[PDB]
Amino acid sequence: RKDVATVDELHASATKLVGLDDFGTDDDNYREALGVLLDAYQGEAGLTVLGSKMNRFFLRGALVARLLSQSAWKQYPEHVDVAIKRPIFVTGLVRTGTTALHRLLGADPAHQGLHMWLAEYPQPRPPRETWESNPLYRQLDADFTQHHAENPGYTGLHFMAAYELEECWQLLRQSLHSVSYEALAHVPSYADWLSRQDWTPSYCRHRRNLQLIGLNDAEKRWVLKNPSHLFALDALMATYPDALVVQTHRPVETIMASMCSLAQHTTEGWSTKFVGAQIGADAMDTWSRGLERFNAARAKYDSAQFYDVDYHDLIADPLGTVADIYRHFGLTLSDEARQAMTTHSYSLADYGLTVEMVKERFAGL
């Protein structure tokens, strides 16, 4: 029916799929998170048969990923000795240039990013030249090319190339702590609960996963990108004290409609509640909280570890912006890095909003 599933059922389904049953300890409070999220989906998300099927798939997927990481850590205990030095974290709203920046900073040969297939299947990153011959990479690469050929994007989910860089929610979902959920469904009870949580345990797990995935590239600086960093800066800094954080900026009133339209099209047919004006209301709340929380938390840290990028200064000149980011953080921009780097309608009214409402809610953000 329209029910998603129970906590026990999800664990059982995850184990049924891969045969693993060690979900690790509950030090990241993933069980409570999952329960709160399930209660939200089944009590207020207004999910359809399709919506329930999709979220059941996504939640089982999060637990399967959790199982894979737990097993990987046992297979590679030496991951604990991997030091993560001065990692770069990119964050900001969708449609503000985070993806472009992520790809640019992650293009530096001396840097490393979260490749999609590794986020889907946590394990030490094999040498690049071996991927096309790797059973798991080919396996995942096949799924993409397949689902892609099926429906050329639009109307529903959206996958990514196996070799492309993924966002941190792909790792944080293992702890069921993510702001992705409230941006794809009407789950205010979960959004509220999450706003009161200490993200530190989830970021500690995030780090353990970076240690594992980066086991063969210990000398490379990690580059991450994800919307959660706006909401969990304290946890981020507690886990990565020497982090270099870059925030993208763009007047929200110029992208709110686009943000809602993206959510609408991605989740089309999944719910009778998360549509139109409700998407607008939820987005206004989620992102104003994210930007406000980032500003509030950022004040207590050394400004030398932060950089603000304007979408307009970025688009005009990508390499110049990146060069200034490196300069600001005292990083050397190599020649190889530069080369690698050089390589109907919708409206606010559709979502029950006015430009005045957006400028007001995001005043100073």
- Cα separation of 156 and 154, whole Å? 6
Method: X-ray
Closest to 181 in 3D by CA, of 252, 266, 255, 116: 266
Give the residues across from 271 on adjacent strands.
47
- Cα separation of 325 and 320, whole Å? 9
Give the residues across from 47 on adjacent strands.
271
- Cα separation of 198 and 12, whole Å? 28
Q: Are 232 and 78 in contact (CB under 8 A)?
A: no
Helix runs in 223-332, H state only: 228-231, 233-239, 256-266, 276-298, 311-316, 318-328
Closest to 38 in 3D by CA, of 245, 189, 249, 164: 189
Closest to 90 in 3D by CA, of 302, 307, 240: 307
Give the residues across from 112 on adjacent strands.
222
Strands 306-310 and 244-249: parallel
Chain center to CA of 309: 19
Closest to 102 in 3D by CA, of 200, 227, 220: 227
Return the C-alpha torsion angle 218, 298, 168, 39, nearest 10. Answer: 140
Chain breaks in the chain (C to N over 2.5 A) after: 343
> Which residue reads 């980032």 in tokens?
294
Question: What structural domains does the chain harbor?
Answer: 1-365 (3.40.50.300)
The interaxial angle of helices 188-195 and 276-298, nearest 10 deg, is 0
Q: Are 289 and 231 in contact (CB under 8 A)?
A: yes
Contacts for 280 with CB less than 8 Å, ≥ 6 apart: 256, 260, 348, 351, 352, 353
CA distances (Å), origin 284, targets 7, 218, 252, 260: 30, 40, 10, 10
Report the 10 Å Cβ neighbour count for 358.
Answer: 23
- Cα separation of 360 and 340, whole Å? 41
What is the experimental resolution, given in Å to one decimal place? 2.0
